[PDB]
Amino acid sequence: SDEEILEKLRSIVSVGDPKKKYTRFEKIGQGASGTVYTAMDVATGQEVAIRQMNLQQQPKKELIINEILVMRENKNPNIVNYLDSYLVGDELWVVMEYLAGGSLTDVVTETCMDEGQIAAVCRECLQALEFLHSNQVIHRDIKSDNILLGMDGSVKLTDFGFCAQITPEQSKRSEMVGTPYWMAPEVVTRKAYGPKVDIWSLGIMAIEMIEGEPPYLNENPLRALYLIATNGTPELQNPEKLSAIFRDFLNRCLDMDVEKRGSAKELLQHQFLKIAKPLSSLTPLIAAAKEAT
Numbered sequence: 152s153d154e155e156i157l158e159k160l161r162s163i164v165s166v167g168d169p170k171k172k173y174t175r176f177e178k179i180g181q182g183a184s185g186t187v188y189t190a191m192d193v194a195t196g197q198e199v200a201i202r203q204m205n206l207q208q209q210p211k212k213e214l215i216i217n218e219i220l221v222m223r224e225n226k227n228p229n230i231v232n233y234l235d236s237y238l239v240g241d242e243l244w245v246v247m248e249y250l251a252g253g254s255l256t257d258v259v260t261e262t263c264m265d266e267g268q269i270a271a272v273c274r275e276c277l278q279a280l281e282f283l284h285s286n287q288v289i290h291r292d293i294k295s296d297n298i299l300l301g302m303d304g305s306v307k308l309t310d311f312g313f314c315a316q317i318t319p320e321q322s323k324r325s326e327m328v329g330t331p332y333w334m335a336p337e338v339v340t341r342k343a344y345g346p347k348v349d350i351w352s353l354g355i356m357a358i359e360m361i362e363g364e365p366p367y368l369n370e371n372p373l374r375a376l377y378l379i380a381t382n383g384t385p386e387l388q389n390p391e392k393l394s395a396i397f398r399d400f401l402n403r404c405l406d407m408d409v410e411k412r413g414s415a416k417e418l419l420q421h422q423f424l425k426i427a428k429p430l431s432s433l434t435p436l437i438a439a440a441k442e443a444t
């Protein structure tokens with residue numbers, strides 16, 4: 152009940168109004184969970200990212216609560232940090248750190264990453280996934296739009312509006328919640344998928360860093376799902392241009408047989424990640440992508 156739900160949120164958030172705590176608001180995006188702004192913390196002077204949402208006009212209240220609770224209790228260096236939340240009337244505020252570097256999508260569509268830079272991004276994403284999966288959380292919507300970058304080359308994952316919390320008693324889900332082009336086949340072909348669906352999505356992001364877009368991008372979402380489920384493991388345009396160790400990494404992420412697909416813990420040991428350049432190597436790409444954005 153919107154009532155029992157509102158009390159739940161009331162217990163979760165900090166008391167009072169945020170309006171006096173932050174200044175210089177600047178819209179930077181929007182989603183089904185609200186509008187996101189860049190703002191200045193009056194006290195600390197830290198620039199943050201604030202999402203404002205009107206509860207009255209919000210379908211799944213349960214999901215927003217779950218999103219906040221998951222972020223609060225699963226802090227990690229590779230996950231955009233959740234700072235606080237407030238509730239003023241029907242206006243819910245969620246405050247988190249701001250990554251000024253933009254998204255990975257901007258980088259892959261505007262620049263050309265080399266393998267050493269790709270291995271670094273993949274490593275950081277895998278660190279977030281290994282952490283989440285070992286903490287019983289499947290993100291379920293891994294894609295370049297949800298990977299943000301710091302001006303120093305930091306790589307962090309965000310938007311837990313679709314994550315799932317599992318347990319040994321119930322280690323699998325069946326809800327279709329991800330984004331078509333990054334969805335693993337089993338999410339379609341059958342019911343009951345596990346944490347490895349995030350590994351598949353990571354593999355698609357790797358293709359993105361290589362080719363600039365995920366497979367079937369020019370195709371209709373409804374169609375893409377069919378193709379993914381029927382063709383399975385995507386085909387690379389110019390496989391011969393990639394190193395043997397990167398090609399092997401890709402095959403382990405995009406394997407059809409879930410059991411055969413590498414897990415996060417396993418892939419963190421993969422030798423492709425060892426050719427990673429320092430994250431500072433991403434700063435030139437971020438600058439270029441940002442200017443073009």
Ligand SMILES: CN[C@@H]1C[C@H]2O[C@@](C)([C@@H]1OC)n1c3ccccc3c3c4c(c5c6cc(O)ccc6n2c5c31)C(=O)N=C4
Nearest residue numbers: 179180181182187200248249250251252253254296297310
């Ligand atoms: C890529 N698509 C969109 C980009 C934009 O708005 C969306 C709605 C969405 O990002 C997932 N969006 C969110 C949606 C749900 C939760 C957190 C966020 C969120 C967060 C940040 C940014 C951000 C930073 C930036 O420098 C440019 C654009 C940015 N966008 C951010 C964020 C951030 O720094 N910390 C959290």
